[PDB]
């Protein structure tokens, strides 16, 4: 039947009720841009920050970073940690893999000395400790390394059953979800591929798919490798956005390198072939020089960063 005006009316009302009883973010249009809160934890790559839509990681909720080994999950999470602290925030790290390397964490900008770390005996304990730290309203971010490592007690006592982690995670997340929103702490769950992921998948508000694309070099061996993140689930902004960035060996995420890609992909930075220029002056010849350039001249590096945030949000 013929209709159009009164139609978009009924739809506008529909969406309203939806969000009125299931939360603002229940339904969305990939095209929308709406929402932009006060607090956000920058990830260390503006490319990933815009892919998130709100300029960083959500607050007061659960986030899931999954992907194979050596993809970039830990790096990305450690940067989120460094930032949280730099804004006068306190971070906790529930380790069940015993793989954390403080030196690297330091080169990323993590205040290790202040870093609350814990290594529980069982899965319950981990989550139980995590919940407790959260309810203190003192934690800003708490990152749990490996969902696949949180083995339940029973299995660890030889008194082994079916899907104990599943039941384990589910009960946990039920309680942790609320306690997080009431506090404002964002919890990061690292998930190594190849678990009790079933629940995490639904409880999570943001889900990032992290994979390594190609191990970049510079005519030399290899200063790192290019990483791609896909936000497969984002209850705070239109989903299915992706982002790529370089992670240098022993260095972490290259902010500058990201400022240059977003730099061209937005007009602010020009490329007269091999040559990267900005507002009349030349940054360098070849991305690596431009990178080395921006890392030296902090001043200009921040000028370019601002112009993108104002250009988008
Ligand atoms: N101690 C370290 N020294 C140097 N590079 C590291 C170190 N830890 C991590 N990395 C870098 O991070 C990449 C991915 O590993 P990591 O950050 O631990 O994430 P994940 O293993 O969860 O994908 C590595 O290939 C490497 O480039």
Curated annotation (Swiss-Prot):
Q: Where in the cell is it found?
A: Cytoplasm
Summarize where ATP binds, as residue positions: 67-74
Question: According to its UniProt record, how is this protein modified after translation?
Answer: This protein undergoes a protein self splicing that involves a post-translational excision of the intervening region (intein) followed by peptide ligation.
What InterPro entries does this protein map onto?
A: AAA+_ATPase, DNA_recomb/repair_RecA, DNA_recomb/repair_RecA_CS, Hint_dom_C, Hint_dom_N, Hint_dom_sf, Homing_endonucl, INTEIN
Pfam families named among the record's database cross-references: Intein_splicing, LAGLIDADG_3, RecA, RecA_C
Database matches in PANTHER family: MITOCHONDRIAL DNA REPAIR PROTEIN RECA HOMOLOG-RELATED, RECA
| Function (record text) | Can catalyze the hydrolysis of ATP in the presence of single-stranded DNA, the ATP-dependent uptake of single-stranded DNA by duplex DNA, and the ATP-dependent hybridization of homologous single-stranded DNAs. It interacts with LexA causing its activation and leading to its autocatalytic cleavage.
**Would you identify the family this protein belongs to, as annotated?**
Belongs to the RecA family.
Q: What is this protein called?
A: Protein RecA
What is the species listed in this Swiss-Prot or TrEMBL entry?
Answer: Mycobacterium tuberculosis (strain CDC 1551 / Oshkosh)
